[PDB]
RNA sequence: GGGCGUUAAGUUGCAGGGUAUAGACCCGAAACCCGGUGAUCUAGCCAUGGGCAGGUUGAAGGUUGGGUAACACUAACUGGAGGACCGAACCGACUAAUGUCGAAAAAUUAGCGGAUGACUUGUGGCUGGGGGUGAAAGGCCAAUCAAACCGGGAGAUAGCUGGUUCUCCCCGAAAGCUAUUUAGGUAGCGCCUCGUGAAUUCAUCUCCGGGGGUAGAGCACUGUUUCGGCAAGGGGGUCAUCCCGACUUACCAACCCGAUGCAAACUGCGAAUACCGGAGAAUGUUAUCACGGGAGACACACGGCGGGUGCUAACGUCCGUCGUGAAGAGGGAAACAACCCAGACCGCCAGCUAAGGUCCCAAAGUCAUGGUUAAGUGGGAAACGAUGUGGGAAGGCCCAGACAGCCAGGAUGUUGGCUUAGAAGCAGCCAUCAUUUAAAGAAAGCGUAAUAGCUCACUGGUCGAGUCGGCCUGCGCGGAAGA
RNA sequence: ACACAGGUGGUCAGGUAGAGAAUACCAAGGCGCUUGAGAGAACUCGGGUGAAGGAACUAGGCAAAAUGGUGCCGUAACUUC
RNA sequence: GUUUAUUAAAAACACAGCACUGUGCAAACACGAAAGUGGACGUAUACGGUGUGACGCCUGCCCGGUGCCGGGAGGUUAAU
RNA sequence: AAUUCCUUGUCGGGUAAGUUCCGACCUGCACGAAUGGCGUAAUGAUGGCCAGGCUGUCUCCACCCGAGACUCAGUGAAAUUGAACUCGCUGUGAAGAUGCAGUGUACCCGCGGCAAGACGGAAAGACCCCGUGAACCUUUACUAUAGCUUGACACUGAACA
RNA sequence: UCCUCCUAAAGAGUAACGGAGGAGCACGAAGGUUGGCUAAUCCUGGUCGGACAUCAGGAGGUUAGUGCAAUGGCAUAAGCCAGCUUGACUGCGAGCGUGACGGCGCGAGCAGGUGCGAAAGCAGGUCAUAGUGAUCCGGUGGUUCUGAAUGGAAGGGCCAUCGCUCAACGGAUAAAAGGUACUCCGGGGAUAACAGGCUGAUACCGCCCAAGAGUUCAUAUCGACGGCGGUGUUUGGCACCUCGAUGUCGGCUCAUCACAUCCUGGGGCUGAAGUAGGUCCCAAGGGUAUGGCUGUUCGCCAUUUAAAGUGGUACGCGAGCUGGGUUUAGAACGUCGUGAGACAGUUCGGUCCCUAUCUGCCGUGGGCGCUGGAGAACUGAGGGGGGCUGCUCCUAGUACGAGAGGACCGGAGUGGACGCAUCACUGGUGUUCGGGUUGUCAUGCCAAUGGCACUGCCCGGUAGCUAAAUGCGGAAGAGAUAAG
RNA sequence: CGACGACGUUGAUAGGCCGGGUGUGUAAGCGCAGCGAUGCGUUGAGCUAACCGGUACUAAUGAACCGUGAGGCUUAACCU
RNA sequence: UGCCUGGCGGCCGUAGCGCGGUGGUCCCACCUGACCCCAUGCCGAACUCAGAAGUGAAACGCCGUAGCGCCGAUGGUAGUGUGGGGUCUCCCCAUGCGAGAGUAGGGAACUGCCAGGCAU
RNA sequence: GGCCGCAAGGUUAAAACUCAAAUGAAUUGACGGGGGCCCGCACAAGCGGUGGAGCAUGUGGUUUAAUUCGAUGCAACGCGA
RNA sequence: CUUACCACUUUGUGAUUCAUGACUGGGGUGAAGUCGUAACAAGGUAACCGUAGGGGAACCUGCGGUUGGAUCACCUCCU
RNA sequence: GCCCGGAUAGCUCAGUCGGUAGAGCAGGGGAUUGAAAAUCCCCGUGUCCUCGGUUCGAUUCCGAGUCCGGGCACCA
RNA sequence: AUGUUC
C-alpha cells in the first residue's frame, strides 16, 4: 500500500475478494477460495494527480475500461501468500505505470563541425574563384 | 572391614494360577517358496485351406505417329499398378442415446473406420510364470495379471480390527515416570488384588525443631524507565591558523542527588500453604512397610486453583494439585458424562433433610415485613450517551426575595490610535469599563467589513419559595442486525 | 448358468427396380419373437411435425436437422506434379 | 496401419528413410546347467542392438563428468 | 508455443463484446537441433478457432404416433432390514435429532407421483496417516549372484634360442 | 546425549516444535601442601607515554577473578604469587543421596606406602555441576587360576588396559537409498482434504474520541492517531463426528430464509434552487438481464433495466441431470531427478449406479366419526394464492432558475415481465379425414384399389390440446402501526 | 384406479342413421377429342375422424343388495 | 573491690561508619639499627632479629555526638489456607495466617575467661 | 512477377527516391610501412648533460583586485623584457 | 394467355488492380555520435571476379581465375 | 516468513581461521607523438557495510538492518 | 616481425 516517499496507496480503495483457484489441488482447490481477486479503482481513488491521468491513459491488461486495477493472484496456495503477492503485483505495476521516460534533449551540431562546414565552404569557394572565365581589359 | 551364607524341611503325587516351546483364545490378510494344470479366449509364430458384392481412378510398361545424329521428348490407342477411392459381406469400436438387480459380467439402435491387404478367418501345432507373447498398454496368458490357475509348506505372519458363551459374593485401579527404530506395542516402577511377616507402623489434629525464596513487596544489586537539579565531557560557529569561546558552553550529557514506575531468567526483604522430622490425645476393619502369586494400565476429558503456548481464542494444547466422569447410579442445572447436592445391598402406598425450589404445566408460600425496577429489565453482550428513578454526604444561590418566565434598558470616545482600504457589542497579535448609575464589555452567536441592526452579559420591576450544578451511588434505557 | 436381443467355419443362393450379395416389395420356404386384456395421466424410451428466430443452449453445434444419384459444364490457393 | 478385450484409439507404438555400433561366420546375439537350435541352409549391398522417424533446408560448440574404445610406461593388486 | 508462472503480456485481425483462435514483437520463469530444429502438399472417427447452410440445441416449448408407466387376471423376484405405536420447530447432546427438553400441529388407512431427509442402499475409504505389513520398479543404497573377464593349477607335450 | 538458568506453583520432581545459553575438552601445573598477598575502576602528578603501556599516592569496594556457558559460591578465600612434591595413590569403606533398572554421586574412618608442614593437620585431582559409551568381538601386558589322557602349551578366566560423532548418543546389523497416479493388505476419524462443530486472530458491518479537509464550519460528506463491539459470509486456528465412505467446483432445474436494501414504498439532514444527487432512519410485499471469452464461481467487456442486492441453507440442491475442471490408469511439453518417477505447471482422452419402506410434499380416494338415517345449500375457524413496474400525455413550460433546464401532488393511456382462464381470431399439431406421388406385391386381367416401404415421401386439414393467439389480475378502500 | 358429472325406456347416455357443417378438393363409371400421355362433360362431384341439429335402430334390462322401524341420559322455557 | 590496657571467645551492623575531643606510669603503637636468625620475584616497605632514645602524630583504644548507616513497633494494606458467592482474563463474603515498604520511635552496644598495670 | 534449380541461386528485369555529379586517359606536385643513388652530430663511435635534488628564470594551471598584454610545435616557454 | 431473346438485379468461385495493415528486410538522405581500418602506395596479408564457410561490422579464409599489381642475379663470371 | 552462500581501496575481486591488508583494473603525473590512442616509467588509495554482543583486540566468532541470487512455502 | 585514427 506504499509506493514512494510521498505517494502512498491509502488502502481505502483496495477491494480484495477471495475466489476459488484455477488448477490442480484435488478436493482442496475446489473448496478453498484462495485466489485473491484484487480490485482497485483509479479515478475516484485518492492517489495524487499525475497518477490518475497516467494510469487511465496507459493500456495494461490489469486496468479495466472503468479504470480499475484488476489482479487475479493464484500463483501460490494460502491466502496470506496470495494477498502479499497481489499487493506486490499492484505495487510493481503502479510503480511501472507511474515512472516516466526522461525527456530526450535534442542536441545541436558541434562547433567543430560548424567550423569544418565553414572551412569546406571557403575551400570550394577559393577554388571556384580562380575557376571559370577570366576577365580582361585588353584585346 | 565389607559381599555372599550361617537359624526354617524338603520331596513326591493330585488340583489350580503363571511362564516357556509347541499354531496355543478363535476368525481374518496382502504376499513368499515349492511341485504340478493351462495358449479349446487371447499375443506372436508355423503349416494348410477358405473370404473379400458392386462401382471409380486410372501408373509403369506396350504399340502406333511425330520429334530427334541417336536419344530425349510428345500425342493418340492400349494396359491395369496401388498397404489408391466410394461401398456391402467381413473385421473393428469413434460419437450419442439406452441399458446399469440389463435381453447381455459389456452388449442393442442410429450413425463410424478399413474394406486386395502391415487384411480377415477356419483346422491343427508351438511358446508358460519371474516365464511366454507384446506395431509396448504393463497390455494379454481360459470373464482372474506390476508376476496366471490348482495343490502343498500353511493353521505363514499380523505389535491390527471383530468375538469370546451360566450365576452370586468381596476388593477394585491406571491412562503417569523411565526406556525403547518408540509412540495405538512392550518392560521396570508408581496404582489394583490374594496371601505371608514386621513394628504406635501410617493417617488425622495440636505443639515443638526446621530449610526455603513462590504470592506479596522493593529497586541495596542485573537490566529497565520518566522527570527535575547536578552536570563537567560530546556539540554547530560566531572554537577564528600554535595557543582557543563566558558563551553554544540552550542540545546531548555519565555519575551523583531527589523523587516515578517495571521484570520468569533482579533480590538489600518475605509470607500463607505445602514438605521433612520430634512428641502427644482421639479415631480409623493395620489403612504403613517388606516379600511372594495374578493382573490390568502406560490413548485420558472436564471443572476449580497456579502457569507455559495461543490472541489473557477455543469443548485448543502442554504441566502441577485437587474432584468428578472413566469405573457412580439418584436429585438439581428445561434436555445436558466432567457443574451443585449426594456414593444406590434388597423390600415398604412411612418420616426428616441436601442442592434446587413453592401461581399453573409440576410436589411445596399468590408467605410476612421494608425497599428498588416500569425495561418483560428479570429472561445475552462493551466503549460511550442520557434532566429515567431510589439513597447519601457536601457545596453554591436564596423572604436583604432565590432559579425560570414578562413588556424592558444594556451603552459616546469601543472604524479603539489597532494586516488598520474591517477584522466595528461579537475573522486582527495589542488589550483598551477609561467617566455614568443598580447595571452594563473598548463583549459572545448572527448581516459578522460593520456602521444598518438582532439579541445578547448585567441591573431593575412583578411573581413569589425553593433552586443550581458536582460527586458517590442501587436498579433501569439507548448502543443491541441473520438467515 | 436360462427356451438369454450375444458368438459360431463352409455350400445354395429366385422375381421387380437397382451397378449390386446395399436397399424396398415379393416367390420356394419359414415365422408372428410364450403372459395377455383394458385405459389412453404424469414421467421415461424410440419416433413425426412446428409458427417467428437460427447456436442466442452449450464445456463444445453433442445431438438433431441438413447435404446426399447419374450424366454434362466448371473447379482456387497450395504441391512432393 | 497397431494399441490399453471390459471407460484413454491419440500428439502414443509401429512404419519406409537416416545414423551410430557390434558381428569375418563354430559369426555377433538368444533359448539352453549341456547337447543343440534360432541367427541361417543367411556371409558385411548380411545379420543384431540402439536412437530418430517420410520429403526439403539442416544438424552448431564442449571429452571437463559417466560409459565405450586404444595404450602400456609406471604405480597399486588376487590365487599361487 | 502441447513448453510462458507475471499472463487475459503488447500490438494487429476476427466479435457489438474473444482468458480460446490467427499474425507478429521476445522480457525463452524453464524451446533449440536425431531423446532431433524448422517447414511441409496429402492423409486424420486427431486437437483449437471461424463462416455459409441446416435445423426444437435454445426464448419456448406444443401436439401427435407407438413401448412401458396406470387398472384387471396369471406367474412373481432384489438390494436392505436391531425393534417401531417411524411429525414440524427452537435448543441440548460424541458438537447437522422421528426418538431428549420445551412447544405446535396431525382422525385410521391406501393409490399415483417427486426425491429434501432417514449422515439412504452398494464397496471393513482406492485420498491421508500408521504397520518396524506386502508387492513390483529404479539406482553410483547394502549384501550377494548369473553371466562376461584376468591369472595360477590340471587335461598339457617335445626340441631349440 | 550431557551441563546451567527460567517456566516450576518457597522440600524433591514436573511437559510442550516454551524462553535463554553451552559441552563432546583442558592441565604434571591450571593438582597437593606450606607460606604469603588482595582486586576492577575512577582521580592527581610523572620521558617518550597518549583515551588506554609500566610509575607514585587518594577514593572505591569485590561493582574484579575463578581455563571454558549459566547458576550457586568463594576474603579463612575456591582469586593471585612463591618453595617442596606427585594423595591426578593401592586395598577397603560405617552411612547416605539419586535412579524402574543398567548406573551415578558424597563419604568419616581403617591397612599399606608417600608428599607438604615445625607441628596440629591437609592431600585417593582441580570451587561444583558439562567434557561422554552397555554388552559382544577381539588386542597388549601381568597372573596364587583353569588347562579335556599325563607334562607342557593353544585357548579360557581374574587384574590392568586398548579399539565403537555405535552423536537416531539404553547403543536393533559388522554391512543399507528411492518411486509407485499400476498398486495391494491390515487399521484409524487415535490423524489430514470437503462439510458440520468450538473460537473470531483474519474478513465484513456498526459504534466511540475525534486533529483536519470541507471559500470560514468536526460532523452535508469523509475522517488521521487511537478505542469498543456485533455477524459467523472468507482465510484461518483446533481435530470433537464421519476414514466397515457425509460425493466434492461450476452449470442446469427448483427454490427458501434473513436484512447489514439494488429498485419500487415512507421519512430526516443536506454544502437539498429545479431535475438530479449525497448520507442516514423505516421497510422483505413483490422484482432483481441477455450475451462474448474462460470449465469457471469471480472478472473484463457490449448492450439493457426501474434494479441487475448482499448473504445462509453440506460456500443448498448429482438416490434431480450434466462432467468441462479437479483427481486415477494412456500420452506429451517445460522443469527437477543419474533413474523409477514427480510438479496448486501446462496439454490431448477418459464407465456418474439405485425398482422409494419410513419422514416430507404434491394430488387423490377407502374406513369410521360428528349420535335416528338421508339429500342439498351454506356460515367460516383456519390456510393458501396474488401484491412488480416503465414510458408517453394532461396537469405545465407551471413551481423553481439567469438560462440551459425543469417539478412535487394528482389524473389518463399504452406497454415489459409474471399469473389465471379460454380456443372466437392467428397459428401449431392433428399417424383417426381428403388428395398427389416413387418402388413393389396382390385382388385373374385393363381400369380401380389395398398391403409395405419412418404415416413410404409429401400437400392440405375437422374436433381436441395448445401459445406465439387473445381476455382478465396487481387494486381502490378501511383499520392498527414503522420511521417521522 | 378410486372419485366427480350425466342418463338407464316416464330414455337422446353412448353408438349408429338422417340432415347440416368442415375438409379435401371435380371421385368411379360412362361419353367425347387426342395415336397416345392426358384433357374435357357428369362435376364443386366424392369422401368426410372426434363438430352441430335431430332421429329409439342397438345397447343403457324387471329386479336383487345395503340402509330399517320415531332416535340415549341429566338438567333447564312452557300446556301438562 | 573500682579504672585502664592486652590476649582469646560470645553476638555479628542497637553492635558499624562520619564529626569532635582523650591516652603514654604499664600495655600497645610507631620508632633505632640491621651488623646477626632471617627478607625483598628490587627495597628492614613487608617479614625477622637485636633494642630502647622519642612520640601519643597516625594506628589503636576511650568518651560524646544520630549527620549517616542499622534496628523498628501498634494499626492499616498486599498476599493466602479452607468453605461459599459474584458483575468470574479478576474480585467479594466467613474464618484462619499475616506480610514488604513506610510511621511514631529506638539506637553512639552488651558480654565471658585469663594476664598486667593503676586506684583500693 | 515469370521460366529454370532439389538447394545455394541463376536468368528475364523494373520503379519510388535522392546527387550534380560518377567516371576514362593524361600532366605537375605531395606521399609510400616502394625502389636507386646522395647528404647533414641523422645514426653509429665517443665525451658530457637534461628527467632525479636545491635554486634562478619562463610558461600551463589555480588564486586574487589585478595577478597587464602578446609568442603558444619543430619555428613559445632565461621569448618581446 | 404463353414460348426464345435480353437489360436491371442476386448468387458462388476466381482473375487483375487500387488503397490499406501490426511487425519486418533492405535502400536513400541527414549525420553532431559509437566501434573498428577494409580500400587508395607493396594501404602495410596485393587487389579484384566467382563460389562456399565464418564473423559485429567493414570483411576473413578456402578453391579456381585476372593484372586493371612496385623493385625482383644481395655468399657467382669471365662459358 | 525465514534459511544457503555474501557485504573488502575509486572499481572487479581476492584473502583467512582473532594480531592482513594482497591482486588486478582504473586514476593521476610524466615518457613518446604533430596530436589522440596503443604502449614505457613513477605514484598512492580503504579500516575490510550502519551495526549490536565477545576479546587486551573484530572482517575473520553469534544476533537487527542493505537483501545478492535465490531455496522452500507441497498432499488431498 | 604486427602496430590504428585526425
Ligand atoms: Mg498435487
Ligand atoms: Mg520378499
Ligand atoms: Mg499347453
Ligand atoms: Mg462403413
Ligand atoms: Mg471404404
Ligand atoms: Mg487355431
Ligand atoms: Mg504406465
Ligand atoms: Mg484376461
Ligand atoms: Mg511374486
Ligand atoms: Mg512353517
Ligand atoms: Mg491364519
Ligand atoms: Mg468399594
Ligand atoms: Mg505409550
Ligand atoms: Mg502400534
Ligand atoms: Mg510479583
Ligand atoms: Mg532497579
Ligand atoms: Mg521471581
Ligand atoms: Mg503419554
Ligand atoms: Mg475405558
Ligand atoms: Mg452421575
Ligand atoms: Mg441426574
Ligand atoms: Mg432432571
Ligand atoms: Mg441449562
Ligand atoms: Mg445495557
Ligand atoms: Mg422365450
Ligand atoms: Mg440366442
Ligand atoms: Mg437386406
Ligand atoms: Mg415373449
Ligand atoms: Mg400415451
Ligand atoms: Mg424432427
Ligand atoms: Mg400434418
Ligand atoms: Mg420452428
Ligand atoms: Mg417456418
Ligand atoms: Mg439462417
Ligand atoms: Mg453461446
Ligand atoms: Mg453429429
Ligand atoms: Mg438425420
Ligand atoms: Mg489410421
Ligand atoms: Mg490386434
Ligand atoms: Mg478400452
Ligand atoms: Mg482392440
Ligand atoms: Mg519418435
Ligand atoms: Mg548435436
Ligand atoms: Mg579425456
Ligand atoms: Mg582400457
Ligand atoms: Mg494471449
Ligand atoms: Mg486481443
Ligand atoms: Mg500466437
Ligand atoms: Mg540430444
Ligand atoms: Mg518428432
Ligand atoms: Mg397383477
Ligand atoms: Mg438440531
Ligand atoms: Mg424417481
Ligand atoms: Mg450410504
Ligand atoms: Mg484399504
Ligand atoms: Mg522446587
Ligand atoms: Mg512446591
Ligand atoms: Mg593458604
Ligand atoms: Mg598524561
Ligand atoms: Mg584451579
Ligand atoms: Mg571448574
Ligand atoms: Mg553388538
Ligand atoms: Mg593335556
Ligand atoms: Mg535409540
Ligand atoms: Mg535413545
Ligand atoms: Mg535402539
Ligand atoms: Mg501416467
Ligand atoms: Mg474419538
Ligand atoms: Mg474443516
Ligand atoms: Mg479548517
Ligand atoms: Mg461523524
Ligand atoms: Mg476428529
Ligand atoms: Mg489441524
Ligand atoms: Mg486432544
Ligand atoms: Mg459431521
Ligand atoms: Mg469420511
Ligand atoms: Mg432495515
Ligand atoms: Mg414478513
Ligand atoms: Mg399487504
Ligand atoms: Mg424476494
Ligand atoms: Mg468452505
Ligand atoms: Mg455445494
Ligand atoms: Mg444420477
Ligand atoms: Mg453440485
Ligand atoms: Mg441428495
Ligand atoms: Mg473421445
Ligand atoms: Mg471429457
Ligand atoms: Mg401468501
Ligand atoms: Mg371451434
Ligand atoms: Mg392450421
Ligand atoms: Mg386445431
Ligand atoms: Mg397380378
Ligand atoms: Mg395395372
Ligand atoms: Mg405384403
Ligand atoms: Mg401443414
Ligand atoms: Mg391504503
Ligand atoms: Mg351424414
Ligand atoms: Mg373433371
Ligand atoms: Mg370423373
Ligand atoms: Mg500489620
Ligand atoms: Mg515489617
Ligand atoms: Mg536475379
Ligand atoms: Mg649516439
Ligand atoms: Mg620530469
Ligand atoms: Mg631538476
Ligand atoms: Mg614562430
Ligand atoms: Mg585486405
Ligand atoms: Mg608489406
Ligand atoms: Mg592491418
Ligand atoms: Mg592489402
Ligand atoms: Mg576464419
Ligand atoms: Mg532475514
Ligand atoms: Mg597519449
Ligand atoms: Mg598499489
Ligand atoms: Mg575512432
Ligand atoms: Na569422456
Amino acid at each position: 500500500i506504499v509506493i514512494s516517499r510521498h505517494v502512498a496507496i491509502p488502502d481505502g480503495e483496495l477491494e480484495i475478494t477471495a475466489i476459488r483457484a484455477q488448477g490442480a489441488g484435488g478436493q482442496h482447490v475446489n473448496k478453498t477460495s484462495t485466489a485473491i481477486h484484487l480490485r482497485f479503482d483509479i479515478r475516484a481513488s485518492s492517489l495524487p494527480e499525475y497518477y490518475k491521468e497516467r494510469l487511465l491513459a496507459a493500456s495494461h491488461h490489469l486496468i479495466s475500461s472503468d479504470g480499475v486495477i484488476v489482479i487475479k493472484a493464484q500463483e501460490y496456495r494460502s491466502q496470506e501468500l496470495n494477498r502479499e503477492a497481489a499487493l506486490a503485483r499492484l505495487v510493481a505495476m503502479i510503480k511501472e505505470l507511474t515512472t516516466e521516460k526522461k525527456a530526450r534533449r535534442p542536441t545541436r551540431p558541434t562547433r567543430a563541425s560548424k567550423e569544418r562546414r565553414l572551412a569546406s565552404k571557403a575551400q570550394k569557394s577559393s577554388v571556384k574563384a580562380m575557376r571559370g572565365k577570366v576577365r580582361s581589359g585588353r584585346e
Side-chain angles (χ1 to χ4, degrees), chain A residues 1-137:
Chain A
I1 70 172
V2 306
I3 291 294
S4 199
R5 55 98 166 177
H6 73 302
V7 163
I9 311 162
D11 182 40
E13 55 208 24
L14 193 64
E15 321 166 31
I16 281 175
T17 186
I19 64 157
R20 286 148 152 82
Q22 155 191 353
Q27 204 171 8
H28 200 185
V29 60
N30 303 308
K31 289 297 304 167
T32 283
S33 44
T34 174
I36 290 300
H37 208 88
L38 175 145
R39 271 164 53 81
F40 167 93
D41 191 352
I42 311 186
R43 297 208 200 82
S45 288
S46 89
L47 284 176
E49 295 276 303
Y50 183 77
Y51 268 34
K52 296 184 223 161
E53 65 185 0
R54 169 164 175 76
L55 292 155
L56 292 175
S59 276
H60 192 240
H61 64 296
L62 298 200
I63 48 185
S64 57
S65 157
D66 286 332
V68 166
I69 302 192
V70 181
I71 288 188
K72 215 152 165 173
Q74 60 197 296
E75 71 182 313
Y76 283 131
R77 187 208 275 274
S78 194
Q79 188 198 33
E80 60 178 0
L81 302 91
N82 277 319
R83 176 170 299 264
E84 292 256 31
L87 289 203
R89 297 200 225 169
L90 164 74
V91 162
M93 66 95 76
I94 278 181
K95 187 166 43 59
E96 180 254 339
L97 280 186
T98 52
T99 72
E100 308 262 28
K101 197 211 214 172
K102 295 200 99 73
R104 187 199 148 166
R105 325 181 83 161
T107 321
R108 44 152 311 191
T110 79
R111 186 60 177 106
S113 156
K114 179 173 300 190
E115 187 58 33
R116 158 192 280 123
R117 190 258 323 172
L118 273 162
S120 88
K121 181 147 199 162
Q123 282 307 135
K124 191 133 190 192
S125 177
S126 299
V127 177
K128 294 284 191 169
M130 311 326 178
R131 282 255 185 73
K133 312 205 160 318
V134 172
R135 60 92 179 170
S136 44

